[PDB]
């Protein structure tokens, strides 16, 4: 199906502690593949997936060089925003940047993104047309006007439709064994009496990839959304994901309930029953 590449950058000022913290991470779909941490010893972009480890020194030196230039822009940006919002030097502030691209089944360009947040809220974002900006407040208009004058959107559009898509394709090819894989969920149900009158039925999905999944409960074929406890999809730590959905069943009504599992790895959606 579709694929994406995303880079996530976090910049946190540290009053009276010197340099701001800077962390960068890169993902292809739901698989992390690179990292940079200003606090680590290496001061280099590093691999976090086996299929990129052997990319070679020209690749690693290049990613290291560019990510250090990102770090320097963010160090200055923190001071610029402190000024735009007339903030004191005493407080810690966070800048976040995310950019990347989506490709379709045929792997050609579908969408590009480039967006920033200051202290957890939208600051500026490149619009879908990759030609215009959305400035979230008064301060952000100064950036919008500056970026409009310096033709920043044209430069970002070139990267998003070019390098981004080109390298996403390369990584999908190099990491085929694990990026182009689909691991269907291993599923099971558990039953525990809260009390003799009631029991919890919990429907599990384990060891799946990609993360996208739908887990629902029905009672006599009717959706039980309001009465389902559904946990956020969570990483197992080995590159797979987990999720569960639970309902409280009055004792003796187990047969009325069905759990429904939908995932890209399943040829047909699953219907599970406690029986």
């Amino acid at each position: 199906g579709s694929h994406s590449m995303r880079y996530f950058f976090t910049s946190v000022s540290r009053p009276g502690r010197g340099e701001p913290r800077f962390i960068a991470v890169g993902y292809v779909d739901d698989t992390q593949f690179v990292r940079f941490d200003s606090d680590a010893a290496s001061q280099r972009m590093e691999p976090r997936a086996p299929w990129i480890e052997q990319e070679g020194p020209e690749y690693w030196d290049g990613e290291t060089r560019k990510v250090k230039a990102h770090s320097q822009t963010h160090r200055v940006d923190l001071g610029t925003l402190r000024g735009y919002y007339n903030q004191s030097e005493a407080g810690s502030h966070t800048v976040q940047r995310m950019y990347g691209c989506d490709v379709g089944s045929d792997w050609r360009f579908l969408r590009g993104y480039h967006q920033y947040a200051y202290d957890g809220k939208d600051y500026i974002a490149l619009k879908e047309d990759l030609r215009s900006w959305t400035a979230a407040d008064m301060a952000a208009q100064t950036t919008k006007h500056k970026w409009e004058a310096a033709h920043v959107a044209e430069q970002l559009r070139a990267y998003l439709e070019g390098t981004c898509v080109e390298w996403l394709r390369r990584y999908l090819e190099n990491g085929k064994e694990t990026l182009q894989r689909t691991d269907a969920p291993k599923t099971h149900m558990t039953h525990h009496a809260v009390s003799d009158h009631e029991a919890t039925l919990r429907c599990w999905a384990l060891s799946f990839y990609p993360a996208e999944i739908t887990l629902t409960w029905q009672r006599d074929g009717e959706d039980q959304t309001q009465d389902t406890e559904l946990v956020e999809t969570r990483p197992a730590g080995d590159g797979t994901f987990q999720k569960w959905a639970a309902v409280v069943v009055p004792s003796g009504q187990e047969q009325r309930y069905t759990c429904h599992v939908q995932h890209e790895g399943l040829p047909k959606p699953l219907t599970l029953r406690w029986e």
């Binding site: 880079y7 960068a24 890169g26 972009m45 290049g62 990613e63 560019k66 990510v67 230039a69 990102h70 822009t73 200055v76 940006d77 610029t80 925003l81 800048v95 950019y99 920033y116 600051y123 500026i124 950036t143 970026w147 310096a150 920043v152 430069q155 970002l156 990267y159 390098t163 981004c164 390298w167």
Partner: peptide, 9 residues
Amino acid sequence: KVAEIVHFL
């Protein structure tokens, strides 16, 4: 690969 040019806020 990350972007080559980064512009200031």
